[model samples]
Each structure stands twice: as structure tokens, then as C-alpha cells.
Target: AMNSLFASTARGLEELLKTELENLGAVECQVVQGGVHFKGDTRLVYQSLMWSRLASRIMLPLGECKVYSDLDLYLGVQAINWTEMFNPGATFAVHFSGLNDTIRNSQYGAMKVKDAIVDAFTRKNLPRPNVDRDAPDIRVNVWLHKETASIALDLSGDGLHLRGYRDRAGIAPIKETLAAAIVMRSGWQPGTPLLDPMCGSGTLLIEAAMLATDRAPGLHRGRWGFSGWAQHDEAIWQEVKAEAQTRARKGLAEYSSHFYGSDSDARVIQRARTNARLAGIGELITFEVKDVAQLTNPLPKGPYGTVLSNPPYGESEPALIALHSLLGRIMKNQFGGWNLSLFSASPDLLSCLQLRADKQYKAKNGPLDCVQKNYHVAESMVAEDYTNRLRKNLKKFEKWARQEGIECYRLYDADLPEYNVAVDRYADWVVVQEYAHKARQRLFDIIAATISVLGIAPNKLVLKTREEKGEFLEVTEYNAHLWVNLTDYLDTGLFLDHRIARRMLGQMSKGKDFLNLFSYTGSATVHAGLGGARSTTTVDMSRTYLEWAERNLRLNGLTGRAHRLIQADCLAWLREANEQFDLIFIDPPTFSAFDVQRDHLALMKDLKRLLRAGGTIMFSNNKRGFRMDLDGLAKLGLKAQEITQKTLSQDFARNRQIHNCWLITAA
Candidate 1:
């Protein structure tokens, strides 16, 4: 008949817990900053454990132990009937939290609890219970915030929110409970379409499907604390578990088409698909490869829908700004009429959206302080008097927290996410993609879609396929999924070697007319186009590629007459046109006998011939263990430096090796 209960939560979401308690028939439920105090029976405890999205653990109060001093803590706890909870052989662990008066250190408090449990067992003429921290039969949690300690049984083991369905690694796996809270925050009624565009591993979509059908997140849980309790009611536990299972089986098809997610990472997509399958919600959530810029927003026919996401933000200055700004722009332009709930750590990103937040809530994302801001979109682009209204609504966030006595750091200054992964930073944002040859296509689509979304039309995708005379004409478009192909051989189109160096070239190409000597598919041309180049001219020996280059330009909506694609042998084209450019790119093939009279067109043979005086030439070749013949450049009165690593093309930043490249510049 234990009526008093205790629940644990993260730094924020006390109000959510309180709401859950109030809805679940809790009496005198007082919501604390990191916990909720309520009155409920064993049924309510199990139900909350099974259903509450915000709760970390649920415990039924056995009794109180009054400690006047540290010794009193031992004496008072030892007075409990140890036989009621555990036998001599039962394993248990002591968890400590809260701090009202004397007990300060959590570990010390756990020590006292441990001592009391052992003494009580010893006094009962039975051997003291073994202390097992990991996988203990009984988990005793003690909370002591502000010195008022409350003892509760740890109903959840290994964190119920983990779900255990995730692969070994994902882009950024959303916490299970956080995903549920986001679903709760997002007004996702059943029979509605929900999408998580950057749904790194499908946590949000999976939780949304679960919430949509009232499918318990804990249905997959192996065990709960009720089983180990002295009042362990097997019949009641089975009844509650069966009820959860029964609920899960009833409306399996209702939410199948309603929840969807997409990611730029193929592996992440694969993992997300598997996680959904493991959660028994694979059919419920559809996943696809989508770049944030090229996200095909699936809208519900009517009004029942929400696009909720927690895209990556933080770690570095440049990368943080770029990604946040990009996300804001997408939300403003593409996701109109959709209720967008974005969790980002950057406040400056608000200006990037070109839209104001309608309702902002302070939410903690792990250690990173985040604001779950909601932006209401209009049918058309028109300003409204919603700023003040939004501010007023934001006030409710504080009001809600205050009413519930929820204590959390201001969202703007909360703990940041642990950025342990190897992230490379560029001018815009941190690049998280692992640069592998196989990941080329996925990366290209993301960049292409990003360019297209940024006002690049489809018809303007300019491409120039570099080819040698003897080599077969090539358009590796179908093969190179996410990267621009630029090589001399018909079989080889793009150089994945200097992928990182390409971004650097883009940044350096301001106001310059770029000369792409071996521009194979015009990706560099497109980068220069986006970089505000005055003009871009790609000259190659492949006529078939020149046509594809025009399409590449048009695809990016950059089909202006200012850019030109030429099909001529770069060696022949370089000698014929003595034109100078502000910027030049020379990525020649290492071994190719395209010219019949030539044994092989070594880049060293024509290095000085192609490069314009006083201009820089970025030269790269994929000959294994390639060496630079800078002596020829030195004799020509020009300096050159081999750049091994450059800012990658947002796709292959994580790639370690591909080719050897050098930047040739005026001495």
C-alpha cells in the first residue's frame, strides 16, 4: 500500500514529470527541479516506470530514516527490517542523491546506507547481503538535494531510456527519454505525419511512433525493481507487463506511415533502420538518405504533423555557425506551414532562419544548454506581430519551471555536449562525415541539395570531365554519388585525395575568375560559383563531360552565361590559350598515355607550362607515394608547398589518405 513515490530526472523536465504524475493519479504531487514527489500505489509506480518519458527511475517509499548525525544515519537505516527487502545472499547497491542537512558527499551517504543494511542483516542472525554495484538485484537510490535525503528503490537498471537497441556507434544517438520528451513537446497526435530530417539513428522517429500508439518505451525492458522488492507481487507485475504488451500489439499499423526520418550518413541510416527494427517499429518509421539542404519534407495532407529534430550544434566556432545557420535557413524556406521544434545551442543562428520563434522552451541537451524553440510558419512569407506573442509564450517556460520548483541553469548557459568525436572545422561548421571512397555519393547529394536549396537551380549544374586522347570518354556521374569527378583517365573522374583541400580553394577564390585546368564535373567550379567568383572556366578534353558540366551548373541554379566549359586536352589547351587567371587548379593524372607521342603526361613535365605567372596552382596526383618535383618550380621562380590536409568537402573530412597535393604560388 506504499502511496508515496519518488521519481528522478535530468536537470530540466521536472514540469513534465509533474504533469505525468498529475495525469497518472498522484496525490499531493510536488514537482522539484530534478525530481517529482508524488503519492501512488505499486500500480502507479510500474505504470510510470513503463510509460513516463521524462522519468529516469521510479521508487516506492518503504519508510524514512532520520539521521541526527552521520552515526544516526547508520542507526536509523539499520533499524529497518532488512529481511523485508533482501535476504543474506541477495545482491544490492546503494545510490545516493539529495542533501538536506548533515550528509554531503553522495558516496559517503551510500557508505552509511551500505553499513546500515549490513548491520541490520547481521542483527537478524543472517549473513550480511553482498554489495554488488553492477547488475544488483536491489538498487537503492538516495537523493539529498539541499540536505533533505529521500530514499527510493531504483526501478530502472542500466537506464531504461537507453533502450539497448542502438548499434555500437551512430552519428549522434538521441537519448531515449529525450526523444520521448521531444515527441511530447511536439503536439504529435495519432494519424499525423512526423519527420526528423537529420534523424541521426532514428531515436526521435521511433519515440514518436511509440508515443503515437501509446506503445510503452519500457515494453522491451528485461526487468524492473518491483521484482526484487519485499512486496514483489508476481501476479501484479505480470498483469501490468501484459497490459503494456497488449497495448503495444493493438494498433501496430496506425503509426507505421506516420513517423519518418532521414540522414546524410548511409551508415547512420542503416543503423537507424536497424534500431527501428529492434524496437519493433521498423515498419512504423521510414528512413532515407537526405542531406539537410535537400530534405524532401513530407507534409501531412491536413494539419496533424510536426517536424522535430536535434541536429548537431557546438564543438567549434566556424562549424557551429555554419550548420546552425544552414538549419535556420532550411526551416524558414523549405519547412513552411510545419510546426518546427529545433534544439540548437547557438543563439546567433536565430538570425539565419529569417523567422522568429513562436514559443521557446529552455531544455537541457545532455551537458549542452539548448533551447527547444518552436517556429510557426505561415502559408506565405509575411511578417506578423508574433515576436511579442512569442516572448509572452516563452515566459510560460519560466512560469512552468517556477511553479514546479524546477531548478536548472538558464538554457543559454547550460552544460555543452561532449564533443569527443574527431571533428574537423572549416569556415562554416564542424564537418562530421568520415571521408571514405565508398561514401562519395551520399556526400555529393548532400552538397548538391545544399547548393540547390541555397537558390541553385537544377539546370545550372556545370561539369567538365577531364579526359586524355587514348582514354575512353567518361561521365562517372552515376558512380560518384556525392563527389565531383576530375581526372584524366576515362575510368577515373574525381580525385577523392584532395577532398579536404577543395574547401580551402573555395575560400581562397573570392572575386577571382577560376581556371580549372582538369576540371572534371565542375564541382570546384560550383564551389567557386558559391564562393562569389566573378567567372569560372573549366577546360577539359571530354566533350561528353562538357555537356554534363552544363547540367551540373544548372542543377545548382547557377546557369549564368558567365561560366564556360570547354572540351580540349588540358596540355594542348594550356599551350593554346595563354590566358591568366586569379586562381588556377591543376589535378593531372599520374600515369596516362593520352597523347600517342607521349609515354606518359607527368604533371612535372607541364607544371610550369600550365600555371599562369603570379597565380597559384593547386596540383594533386594519386600516384602511390607521390613525390613533388618543386625543383622545377623553384627554377621557374615560383614556390610550392604540398598540402597533405585541407578542409574537406563536408563529406570526407574524416578521410586520412587519398592523394598527394601541392599548392604552387608566386615566390
Candidate 2:
């Protein structure tokens, strides 16, 4: 009986999972968010596990309980007859996820269940079962969400992403499950050449080769998650696994020399070759250490192949825009008759390729939202124009930034009549802001496509309605090298106008102790830390910003205890501090939330207590014409010098009252 098997996969692959499962002979499929629930006997379950390329994990539900409390959770587990599922002598481990108000912590809930199992066993006068984290005899999955606890046997250890062909990945190893799903849906036909030009470690090519040859993804693996299950049918499992290898031999014999993979990195090509050999298709595919720009038509020019690639996006490698544009041009000119399937997070980059997707699917590459777009490569219908305006601006600023080593700067300030959006570049990434409009979505194409025409990676180029939105992105920055959040807030984590102030602070921070109050996103702390500050303390009232600050600091290698993130009201923190810092950056919001603005500027009196005798405070605010208190600071023995003009960059020269900055010394 035990016929209901639930299979899970990455988001957006649920439909594909159901399709794949039905083909594997599973019946009564109910597709859900992350996976599908289908009923099949032991042989069918084993068949699905051995043959499924889409299922990430296949679980056999042991029990289900409606729980409101930990005691209910414990009692529920006790009723499952742990002895019947696995022996009292079996070594097991529990994996817990989701949560209930009563049992909020995952480990805590797992422990409660473990306790229930031990007690349930003890009451039966059975020998104590041993708990093993790795290589356990039995693995249990407990999902507690929506007020119910569903327990299942984890029958997919390493959870099926590892198909045993490669130990590690080449570049960003698109997990096997995701890669298989993409290939299955990529409209790539068998016997037609399958090419992944930017193939890192060759997951896409290997998967394609496997699919074309009719090789089961799980054929190479000797062990599986169900190997340790108490009711594991070795006879049926052996027969199913053996059937896989038998089919695989025929697949290898009929394999064609069609898969093509290329990467700019030589070392990665070597890895791809090794992965190919491991996948048992070593000689059938060709991998080369060729740059994307150097790619020609991979499929001999007459019979077109599929140009499949998962190009880089702006999540970090924003500077790789030209890389994408290069792919687009070659694909269009050289592979004229080919089919193209690209997985990307950036649509702007797709436009630069000048090829329109005939079909597309939404998916994720880890945490980044991505899309796989299919194109039948021929003559592009999109007339290339207007992008000249973007290129002209890019040419001027791109060269200018190079000479100055500028990573982030304004590229377009609503320069064209069709566009009223201001554009800025953060190294490889571009942000376009509109004060705003859209002759309905067409303008974004002009802005994004134009900018990306020279090349911007897909999701890397984004147009946010200035009138606001949430979605945090980390983009590269200038010299002191910090990761700045480009979205999810009104302002990017770095104030382009304050670029001058940060440099000034950087120059003064070497070997000095630094302090930052309300340092939104901690770019200031990173500047100080990377600028050779011996120690830096970052305090912010918002823990959200503090964590962002911490990520900035840590990501920039400003780790260890010397760089501190403190969560406290700045005013309160200043009063309690007995220590002094050589430098301080105080850039609190002028008015936060309904003008509940208490005095950040007025808190200078207490701050002077934490200021080093030889050092100064760099205070900045964008509140226009908010006069500095000359008389008030004089009474506190503090002298102020306005570095306002010094901090202004040429981009903001259109109008200069952007912000006023002061370097104050409490003498």
C-alpha cells in the first residue's frame, strides 16, 4: 500500500514535474507549489526516483498531525510507530522546516520529535535508537506549516541535485534539477546540435546530452535516499536501477557529436571536460577555452542547433554587460538559423542580443528570479535605433569613469525627449529612475535596451518608478569597494552626491578609530574599514539596516571583531559610550516617517563626548537650507567647517543644494 509519493522541485517546475512523473508511470498527479503528489506503488516510486530528472526530492509520507503546541507535536510523533517505520536499532536524523507559533524554532521542533521517538521507544522496552546526522540508516523530514505537521521519509539524500557525475560545479552550477527542467522545456530537439556557449562545468550540455541519448539522470548513482528506508525493497530497487543502466548503454552507443560548450576561463574548460567524461559522454561533446565573443556558428552553418546559455546577471557581476551583448551579436550574425534558449534574470540584456523570445518561462537561479527565453534565431524584427543616445552617453562616461576609476556615476539625466528617466551606472549595473512616465512600458525598452545594446546583463538593467518599490540588490562600488543596495529603497545604499564625502572620510580614516551613527547600509563603515581604520563601530536604530551594514562590511572583507555593528538609538548610544573615535560619520535621515524627526543634528553636544580629542565628525544631511547652528555649536566648544562645495560632484551640478556637509571639530 504506501503508494502516495510527493515529489518536490524548484519553483515554476511544478507543471514540468507533473508531466515528467506521469511519463514515468505515476498516476493521479496533484501538482502543488514546490512539487507534485502522485500515487504509485513501490516499483513506480522507485522508477520515478531512478528516472525523474525534474523531481528534486521524492518523499514518502509516514504520517500527518494537526498540531497547535510542542506537546501536541511530541504526542503526534509518538503515535507514528517509529518502530514500524525504522527499527529501534536504526541510526536516524530529523530534518525540520516551516514552523508553528507553538514550536517556532526548527531545531527545537526536531528535538521535540526526537524526544518523542526516544520516549515512544523507551515505553516499548526497545533498545535506544542512535541518532546519526550523516549517512544515517533512516532520514526523516518534518514539515510544519499551515497548522499541520506532515512527516515523511527522506528518500532523496543530497536531495537528487547530485546525479553523481560531477563532485562540484564549473561556474555557477545550475543545479542538475533546474538545468534538466530548462533543457526539457528549452524546445531543443534531439539530433539537432545542443550548444551552451558559456558553459561552466557543462551541466546544461551534459543534461542535454543525457536527454538526447535517453540516459536516465540517476543511472550513475550507486546509492539513493531510500537505501536506508526500513521498507526499502532491494529486489524491486535493484531491478529498476539495473533497467536504468541497460537503457543508458544504448543511449551512449547512439550518442552524436553535437554538444558544444565554451568558456573564457581555461581552468573551467578543463573541469567541463572532466565532468563530461564523468557523465560518460566524454568524446561526444566538445568544450573549448574560447571567449563568448569568439564564438562562431557551432553547428556547421546549415543545420541549426540550439544556442543554450545561462548568462551572467547583475546580482554581482554587473560589469559583464558587454559579455552578454557579445553573445547576442554572435548568435544573431553567426548562428542565424539556430534555435536559442537563454536563462537570464535580466530582460534588458535580452534586448541587447537583438533577438526576441518566442516563448519564456519564469524560474529562479538560487535566490535570484530568472527567466528562460526561447528564440528561433533569424533576422531580428527589432529595428536598432535610439540606442545610439544610450551608447553616446555610455561612451563619454564609460571612458571618463575608467580614467578616474569610478565604479558608480550618473550616465543619463533624462537627456532625451522620449525619456524623462535619469540613469546611473554602478560598475556593471545600471539604475534608471523616472520622476516619471511611460508611454506605457515602451520607454523602458528604449532606456534599458539602448543602455544594454552596448550591453547590460538582463536583470542587471532595471527601471524603477521613482514614485517607489522592495527588492534588495548589491552592486559594485568605487575604490573602498562596498556592495551597495540598488533597489528596495528610495536611495541606493551609497549617496552618489556623498561620493566626495566618503573619499574625504576614507583619506582621514587610516589607522584611526571610526564611528557611524544611523549609517544606512554601512557603506560609511566599509569605507572606514577598507580605508585602514583600526576599528569601526556602526550603530543604527534599525536592525534591518544594521544587518545590511554588516553584509556590506563582511562582504568587503572588513570582517572580525574590529568592525562592529551595534543596534541602538544613536542618541542613546552616544550617551552611553565611554570610548572615543578618531572619526565619525553622522548621516541620519532628515525626517523619517511622518516627520517624527527628533534631532540627529541637535545631538552634536553628546557626540563630542565620544569624539577623539584630535579627530572630527563628518555630519551630512540633504535637508535644503537647514542652517547650521553657529552659535549653538560654539557653546558646546565645537567648531564647524562646511565641506559642502567640496563634496559636490559634476553630475549634481545641474542644481547644487542637494546636501550640506560639515566637518565639525569638538576642540
Candidate 3:
């Protein structure tokens, strides 16, 4: 007759156990959160105990009863005749879990169950069963969901995970069941080579060897709950056991799969060898003491295999991070064209690998929830997909830029959330800026993609995060031969948005004496010289900028005393200077030595003294919320026309509000 049985597993493996049960011919298989319930005969149950790799325990459910109080539980448990279940002298233990408000503590619930069983034996005039917590002849499991209590007999004695092969376990040892599940999830076929680089105590290697050899995991078990049961079928149990033993022998003889394991610690490898010998697969596995960083492919060329590892999750996060990164590099260099599987409890610890998983499975080692991630080493192309997207965007933008005669422009700017970076092309050089520092692998991948797409060598690339942009200055930009220091300053000496403004200054400077107040790096001065100006005067408070202005003018061959650079505060210099000019440029920083509004008004009023009649002032500033004092300027006989739209270059049209520009003329 078919009877109800339950196969318990670790938290994340219920689906796998359910499939395993169905494969074993169990009927009415219903999967629950941490186990599967099925109906099968004694033979099927025995077979499950013999071969089910992931089953933690197999139980025969006795019955269930509603209980709201200790007395109710005791009475309910007393109703089950203890005499029929086990001998009065049998050593037994009760393990209780789950509770409600009435049975708040599992200990009290277990106490009630024990009292009921003892009293039932006493009332029947038989000796009560002795309690043996460690080595019990009869193990009873009690679970209370809400107000109901379930009682069951643990049929597999010690948990099925204890296959009697592990003589030694390393720190945080991977459980036998979890190791087997990870091996199966690797999708490895027999006769293929399997390797575990961080083998430790060699649980993964032993499991892989046993699986490939078709050895029954439970063959080494010496005792079971049904051994002393009145309903035990000794003859049929013997038959099943004999069949498992015969199949194991045949499987081992026909097995051709090769298993290899390596660890840094020699003692751990020795312990692993002993474990494999106990499991009767010592001849099938090769053990070595080698650091994972030095791991190389043991198989010859043209032979492909799977490399599975359960790397140590060190106490310190930095240690695990380093190990994960090293393992990734080793696999990429030494194990290319092979399948790779990594099992780790801390998902963050796997980030340094930089390899994305093609397949992932949820698993657990006792209480630690983990992930088994598989990668195809041969198919790994660092950010190939991201590169493709970057290439597409680059092509789209580059076509427009080339047609518009724009060489220096932004090719990519935070287009993908995963890669929060801004890529700006500076002719032969690409300057990349990271918006955030947290996305490590994706950030590196983005840089790699930029290098590949732009054909910019490593030396030509200037990469920095928002946090660190130190003293790195170089020359990069548009016509009139601009000078930009990308590293030393938060901004380049030349503003890309003001490219047209500089060009306008150059075109309008013919035969006119030019005045560039608050001039930065003399870019405007150089433009005026290029426009054939008679003489140009560049003024700023920064001596450093004045010197840089000189260098820029010299770089463009716009030298001589005609391009005079003054190192003085522009507000004061404008008030004191009595020289007249045909054209002027006033662009002040948001942060200056004086009140911006007050100084800007003063500079406008003072400009009349230095400007010849009908001369123009190209005023520009990057303050987003600034409103011009048009009425005040008009009272001072100055007319201001906003030329911001007309001055925006094609590349900067996407962001027209970047800077405010105007053409101011004394009316």
C-alpha cells in the first residue's frame, strides 16, 4: 500500500528535490517551500534514501492534531499509542519547531510531547522509553504551524546530507547536499574533466567524482530509523541495497570522467585525500596543494571542461574581494574556452570577478543563502554588448559632428544608468569622467568600451572620477588654437559652449583694438590677434592665468607686445584704465573677490570710460539663474541684445542653457 512521505531539503533546493522525487517514481508529488510531499511504497522510500543527493531527511508523517495549550498538546500526543510505534525501552528524542501564542517556546512544546509519550507508556504498565538526544533509536519530529501540531518519524536516521564520507571539514565547509546540487547545476557531462581550484577540504571534487561514477550517496550509511520498526521489510531492503551496490560497482568500472582538485593548504589537501579514499573514489580524483592564483589548465589543448569553485568567504570583505578578482584573472588567462562555476554566499564578494553569469541558481549551505553562478569563459568579451551600444551612439553622433565641422564634442554622456560616465572627444584624446564611484566593474567596462570604440590608446585617454581631478592639464580644443588644462582645474581653460563666441570675437576684431577683461587663459586675446586686431589687452586677477595666457598666445604664434596680458583685478583695472578700445569682452566668474551683481554693474558703468563710441561688449557667464540688469544698463546708455541662441555651436545645441551670452553696445 502507498503511504505518505516527505523529503526535506535545504531552503533553496525544494524544486530540485521535487524533480528528484518524481524521477524516483513517487506519486502525488507536491512541492512545498523547503521540501516535497509524495505518496509511495516502502521500496520507493528506501530508494530515495539510497540515491537522493539533495534530500536532507526523509520522514514518515504519523498524524496531526489541533492544540492551543500544553494540556491540549499533551492530550493529543497521548492519543497516539506509543507502544505500537516503538518498543517501550527504545531510546528516543523529540525535536520541535514553529509555535503560536499558546506554545511560544519550542522547548516547552518538546517537553509536552516527551511527557505525553512517557505517561502513555507508564499508563500501559510498560517501562518508559529512555531519552537519548545524541544517538536516539527513535527520532520524532514535531512542528506547530498555528494551532495544529504535526508528528513524524525521521526515517533517514542521521540527515541524508551526512553520507559518512567526510572525515574532516574545513572552515565553513560546503555541505554534501549543496556540493552535489552545485555539481549537477554545472551541467557537466560524464567523461569531461572537472576541476575545483579552491577545493579546501575537496567537497566539490568528491561530489563531482561520486556523481560521475554513479556511486550511491547513501551506500555507506550504517543505520536507519526503519531498522527497528515492526513494519520493516528486511528482505526488500536488502534487495534494494544489493541493487545500489551492484550499480555502484558497475558505474565505477565504466566511469571515465577525470576529477582534479587543488588548494593552497597541504593539510587540507591531505584531509581531502583521506575523505575521497573513504568514499571509495580515491583512484578517480587527483589532489594537489597549489594556490588558486597559480592554477593552470591540467588538461591538454583542445580538451574543454568545467571549472567549479567554492572560494573562501573570508571574514574581511577586502580579502574576499581580492580573491574573487584573482580567480577571475586566472580563469580568463588559463581556463579560457571552459565553463566556470562559482558559489558564494555574499553576492558582493563576487563583484570583483567582473564576469557576468549566464546562469544562476539559488542554493544554501546550512543557513547561509548562496548563489551558484555559471559563466562561459570562452564567450567572455569584456563589455562587448556595452561596447556595441557605445559604438552605435558614437556612429550616430560622429556623423552629425563631422558634417558640422565639430571635432571636439561629447560623444556619450550618461546614456546608460549602469555606466554613469561622460565621454568627451578631444580630437585624438578622449576625456572620460565618472559621475559616481560605486559601479566598479561597469565603470571599468565603460572605459574599455570607450577605448575600443574611439581607437584612442591608453596614453591619449584622460580618465577621472568626480572625486579626483588633480593637477592634470593639457591642450585640447577648437580654432584660434585653444589651450585647456583638464587636470589642474575643475574646468578647462576653454569652454566648448563659447566656441562660437571666441570665433565671433576673432571675426569682429579686424583693425580694432580689443579689451578682454576677466580674460581666462587669453583665449579671447588669441582670437582677437587671429582676427587681425591692431592690438589686444588681456586682464585678470590671477598671475597664473596671465602667464597661461602668454603661453597660449605663443602656442598659436600670436606673440609680441601687441597682446599685452595684465595681472590685476578686472573690476579695479576697468575703473582705473583710461585707454579706449573698439571692442570689449566682460565674462566674470560666479565666484569673484567682489559682490557679483554690484561689481558687474560697476564694470558695465566703468566700461563707458574705456570703450570708444559704438564699440561692443560680448558679455557671458555660466550662472544658470542670473537675470540681466537691462534697465540699469540702458540708463547708462548701453543696449544689450541676448545672442545666446545665435552663439550656441551645433554640438552644444542639446544644452542651450549651459551659458548666457549677450552682445552689449554703447548706444
Candidate 4:
């Protein structure tokens, strides 16, 4: 009579094994945790041995009984008809698993079961079976759970995964079954060409060839656990085995698909070549010594193919990061309209493949938890968290900015530092600036998120390595036309934080003589000039900035001899300007390089001497943790008060330290 059989497999492959077993005419195929339990005849078991690609081993249950203690376990094994299963002349071993409270240790439990089998042999007055751990003639599987002892005969002996094709394995090689699953899950068709550029040890390429030709994974296997059994059914085994061999021979004769395997390491390439030969498919696959960079699409235009690979998941992340990024770029740029599959234990590494994956699955590769990502090998575009933030920011800032006539503003200022980037909108163009940034591991994702939510074209999305402002783009603030170069230079010509300070200076400056010190691009000068200041003087050290400042003044129609543009160091120019003004705006770099402590005190003293009595100076800087000398300023005959909140705009409300503004007047 045929017994109930179980086909054990890698974790997460139970369903695949169940389908395989059902195809072999096994009935009631039930998928359990690590295996599938099915009722199949002896002929079916032989077919499974010859054809099943996913099974690790096929086990036939002998007996199982309730066991309260070791004595019960011994009795249960003795009743399994050990003499009928394997004769006393055969050498055998017991493979044990699981434990009950009564049978606590696996080894001791195996020993007790072995003793029971021996006693059964001796009681019948037969020669004893010798123990053979390495090459056991008959293999017994013992499993104990709760209060029951279960016994089974292993039918496949060693694992079916050891296809005898590989004599050597790559370091952390992909398991044969998992490789098969990846190929299957990838929807790789038989007639299509396949390539594995990072094919270490050639397991994936071999599996692909085996599947494409319908070559039995077990066609080359030399031994079986069923050979040692008394009820071996040699007739059925030979019938199935011959059929598998005949089919493989016929399939290989008609095979048309090409498998290309390569690796930079010549040693692994030779090892993979040898493995292909051993698998009897050496002529079907082309092996080469080439790095992933040297690989180009040979069939770029026609007969679209698959590029399947298992790239390195090195322990040192920073080292492999660039390599994975290079792979991503190549696949996206070269392999157009092809299938791509990547298996990795590191999810971060997979994201480096810039294009989006069509499907993803979770499985275990030996001890490492891994993922298989399948892609269409075309352009596509994480960043969901960042996009959500962008969506909210757009909703929050979009209407208010339009109402305030703001054409250029800070959109996302590293709001989430994990992204480590700042996104600013200069009219229609968007500039993404890296600030102590992390990845195009995430850089691609960040760009995708910006483009998707903002609904901008690829051309409009500008990626700055650091940050730049160039090519005189026109944008507006507080009703004045400003020319800003959004590229070519580091600072974007406009300081977004001082939006309120410029407005406040304009509000109080009607009919007053105005002075703008360190007036970058003459932004505040335009504000005061538009506010109808009687006269204006703007000073800075850069000719480029002074030229930019002159263009900005011309753009706003705020021109003429009444407004003086002085190209000198602000401190030097301040010392030379003997004229006192009604209002002055002095916002310098926090250090003179821009330092705010000693030099700022000296600067404030310099401005105070030029200040008309009762005239005011608006002093500001963006330096974090800046201090002002209250006693020293009072001694300089100048009274100082901070207007930090007064000069803050709603756009920069989240930044409490974006800038510090103080109002200093003659005492």
C-alpha cells in the first residue's frame, strides 16, 4: 500500500511545491508551513523525484503514535515494520527533528528510536543493521511534536537542490530552488533570450536553461533514498527516470534560447562555465569575463529579453552604493522594453535601480531574508512621504503665496532631513538643492516625488549638485520686479527670509533718505525707491553683484542720479560716507566674513555716527545663537531693540532662527 507523502521545500515555497506535486498526480495536496502533505502512489512519488524542481526531499510516513515519555517513543518506532522497510544487512541512520516535553533532546530521542529499531531486528533473530551517518543505505526521519512520535522514510535521500551541476559555489550563492522561483516569478518566457551580467557561480543562468528546455532538475541525480527500501518499486522508478532523460535529450536537441552569463571576476566566470558544462548546457550559454559596466545591450532593438542578476549585497553599504547605482543607470538607459529582475537581501540596494519595479515578492535565501524585484526595464519614477509633505505644503503655501504676489519662494527646506534637500520654485522652474545629502539611492526617488506632485516636465526639474543661481530669471516680491539667476552661482540672488524686513523698510521710508548696506542685488533699495524714498545709496564689494543690482533697479523702473550705486566694502564705504541719512538698512553676513559679535558692534558704532538724530537702522543676520552688546550699544549713544517677530513672514514661519532683526536708533 502507498503511504501519505510530504515534500519539504524552502520557506515561502510551499505553494509552488504543492502545484508541482499536484502535476505529478498527487491527491489532496495540502500546503503546510515548510512542506506539502499529499497522498500519492509509488509511481507518483517516482515521478516527483524525477520532475519536482522545488522539493528539497520527499518523505513517506511509516507510523505515528501518542508518546507520553521515552518508553512510549521506543514502542512507537518498534511497530513501524522496520524489517519490511529495510533489511538488517543494510547500513542506516536516523535523522531526527522536533522535541516534546517527554522527548526533550533531539539526539537522545534519535538514539531511543534507533534502539527500538535494533531491538525489532534482534527479536526476529536477524543480522543487525550497521550505523552509517554519511552514506546511509536506508534513511529514517523522526519528528516529535507535543505528545506524539512520528516516523518517516526519506525517499530523496539528499536534497533535490544538489543537482550535481555545481562542484563549487560562489560566496553566498543563490540557492537553486530560490533561483528557479525568481525566474518563474519574473515571467521569463522560454523562447526569449536571458542574461545575467552579475552571474556568480551561474546558478540563475543554469536554472533558466534547465527550465527553458524542460530538462528535469533531477535528470542528472545519481542516487535516491528509495533504492534502499524493500518496497522500492524499481520498475516504476526506471520508467519515470528514462522518460525524464529522453525528454531532456530531445529538449536539448531542439533548444533555441540563448543564455548569457558574465562577471568581472575571471575566477567566478570559470567556475560558472564549469557548472554550465556539468549541467550539460555549456553550448547553450555564452560565458564571458566582463564587468557590469562593460556590458551593453546586444539586442537593444529586437527580440526583447530579460536581464536577471543577483548583484552583491556587501556588508559595507557605502562601498556597494555606487556600484548598484551604476547598474541602475545601465539598465534604465540601455535595456529598453526588456524584462529585468533583481534579487537582493538589501532593499536599499534594489532602490538604486532607478526605474520603478512592476512587482515585488518576499522570500528567504537560506538564512538571509530577501526580495525579488521585477521591472519592465523602462523609465519610471518612494518619495511618498516626501510627496505627501509636498502635497500638504502646496496646499498650505500655494494660495497664500499667490495672494501675496510671491513668484519665488522656498517650497521644502529640508523639512525632512532624511531627504537632506531643499526644493525652491522660481516661477515655473524647480531647483532641487542637495544639503549634506544622502542618496540617488533616494535622489531618484526625491526627483520623482517632486516631479509627480508638482506636475512638472523633466526639463523643468533642475537638479543642482550643491545649489546655484544663474541666467537672470525674472520673479517678483512685494510688487517689485526682480531678476534672479536660478543657476550658475551658489546663492539664488534673493534672501527669502528678509521678505518682511524689505516690506517694513518700504512701509516707513516715504520721503526719507535711504541707505542699503551690503545691498545684495539692491533688493531693499528697490523696495525703498518704490516706496518713494527721496534719495537712495546702495553699497556692496562685488562688481557682479553691483551689476546685478543695477539691472534689478532698471527692471523696476526705479532709476536715475538720485540713487547712487557704490561698489566698495560695506565697512569701508560706511567709514567714508560722511552724510547722515533718515533711514538705513544694514544686514551683513553674520561674520564680517560675516561675523556678528565684535565687528558688528564696531559696524553698528560706524552706522550710529552716520545716523541722523532720531534716524533708524534695521540690523539683521541669519547667524544661529547670535548675541548683541546692550551696554556697549547704549554707550555708543545708540538704543537697540529686536524686531525678530516684526520682520517674520508667514512663508518662513516654521523657521524661528531664519533671521534675526534688530532696530537701532540714535540715543
Among these predictions, the greatest TM-score belongs to 4
Off by over 4 Å in 3: 167-172, 314-322, 346-356, 379-438, 443-667
lDDT per residue for candidate 2 within 1-667, as digits (tens), equals 7598899898788998898899989999999889899988889988998889988888888888988887888878887877776743578888899887888788998898888887877898888788888667778889988899999888876667777787633234588989998898799988888888789889899988988787887877756667656678999988997898888899889776588899988998998998889888777799999878789775554677788998876562233545665577778788887889988887766655766788998888788788888988774333244466667777887887777677788876766656666778776777877665224335535553555565665557766664435555555556666666677676777777677788888889999999998888888788788789999999888887888888888788888889888998776677777898999998877775312124644578878888878888999888766778778789889999998888887666654346888999964
Query: Cα miss at 378, model 4 (Å)?
Result: 3.7
Off by over 4 Å in 2: 87-89, 168-172, 316-319, 379-667
lDDT by residue (tens digit), candidate 1, 284-374: 7889998876876666244546778876654523333345556656665666677777766655444345457777777777677777777
Cand. 2 Cα-lDDT: 0.78
Q: lDDT of each structure?
A: 0.61, 0.78, 0.79, 0.82
Better TM-score candidate (1, 4):
4
Clashes of each: 56, 5, 1, 12
- lDDT at 7 for candidate 4? 85
Candidate 4 on 1-667: residue-level lDDT in tens?
5558888888899998888788778898999888999987778888888788888888888889998877788878887888887853688889889987777788988788888888888999888788888878889998777777778999887777878786423343777877888888876788899999999889899988998888998888767888788988888888998888888998899997799988999998998998899998889999999988788877766688898988888552333554676677788788888899888888777776666888998998768888888988763324677988989888888888888888787788778778878888888988888776245457656766677688766566667774232367888887778887766777778988788899889988899999998888999988998998999999998898999999998998877898889888887777776998989998888765546765788888788878887799999888788788888889998888899988887767776466888999877
Per residue, candidate 3 scores C-alpha lDDT tens digits across 1-667 of 8989988888878888888888878889888988899988879978888889999889988889898777888888887767887853578889999989888888988888998888988888888788888778888898888788989888888878777786322333777887888898986666789999789888888888877887888888767877655567888799889998898898889887679999999998998999898888889899999987688888757478899988777442323454676677778888788888888876665766777789988875667778888888853366676687778878887897777666677777666667667777776777777777246556555665676577666566776666534443444344566666665665656666687788899899999999998888888888888889989999988998898899888887877778788888777787688989999987878776675555567778888888898798888887767778988888898989999888876555655256788888876
Supply the TM-score for candidate 2. Answer: 0.61
Alpha carbon lDDT at 141, candidate 3? 93
